[PDB]
Design a protein around this ligand. Structure first.
Ligand code: NAG
Ligand code: NAG
Lengths: 91, 50
C-alpha cells in the first residue's frame, strides 16, 4: 500500500460508489471529511488500471447520534483474480 | 513464486535471487524482474512475435 504494487480502492461516500485500482500513495492517517471539506484517502494516482463509478443515491452525510437502524453486511474475497463482493442490507 | 490463475502483478522491485539485500542496485543475485527480447524481421519462426 505504498505505490510499489497495485492497490484496489473502493469508496462508497453516501452518493456514488467509486471503485479504482491504482498504484495509490496512502496517507499516514487516511480519511474523507464529513458539508464534506476534505479528501485525503490517497495522495497520488499513477499507472492506474481500472476505474468504475456507479449512479447517484442518497444516504446519511451529517453527524447525527441515536440508535442504529441499518445493518449493512459485506463479504470480500479474491479467487483467481476475480474480486467477489457480496452484501446484504437489513433494517 | 509462481502466478495464480489470471493474477496480474506489476512491480519494478529488483529481485534478490540470494540473500544479498541490494535494495536499489542490480548486481550478482540482484536482477530486475522485467526483461525484454526484441523482434526482428530476420529472426526465426520460433523467435518472431505472435
Ligand atoms: C464521492 O466520490 C465521487 C468520486 O468521483 C465524487 O464524484 C463525489 O462527489 C463524492 N461525494 C461527495 C464529495 O459527497
Ligand atoms: C509506470 O510508471 C512509470 C513511472 O516512472 C512509467 O515510467 C512507466 O512507463 C509506467 N508504465 C509501465 C507499464 O511501467
Amino acid at each position: 500500500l505504498d505505490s510499489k504494487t497495485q492497490s484496489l480502492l473502493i469508496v462508497n461516500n453516501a452518493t456514488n460508489v467509486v471503485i479504482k485500482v491504482c498504484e495509490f500513495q496512502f496517507c499516514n492517517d487516511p480519511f474523507l471529511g464529513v458539508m464534506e471539506s476534505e479528501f485525503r484517502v490517497y495522495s497520488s494516482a499513477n499507472n492506474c488500471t481500472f476505474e468504475y463509478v456507479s449512479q447517484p443515491f442518497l444516504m446519511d452525510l451529517e453527524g447525527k447520534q441515536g440508535n442504529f437502524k441499518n445493518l449493512r453486511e459485506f463479504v470480500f474475497k479474491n479467487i483467481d483474480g476475480y474480486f467477489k463482493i457480496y452484501s446484504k442490507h437489513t433494517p | 513464486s509462481n502466478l495464480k490463475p489470471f493474477e496480474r502483478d506489476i512491480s519494478t522491485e529488483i529481485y534478490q535471487a540470494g540473500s544479498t539485500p541490494c535494495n536499489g542496485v542490480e548486481g550478482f543475485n540482484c536482477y530486475f524482474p522485467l526483461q525484454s527480447y526484441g523482434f526482428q524481421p530476420t529472426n526465426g519462426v520460433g523467435y518472431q512475435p505472435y
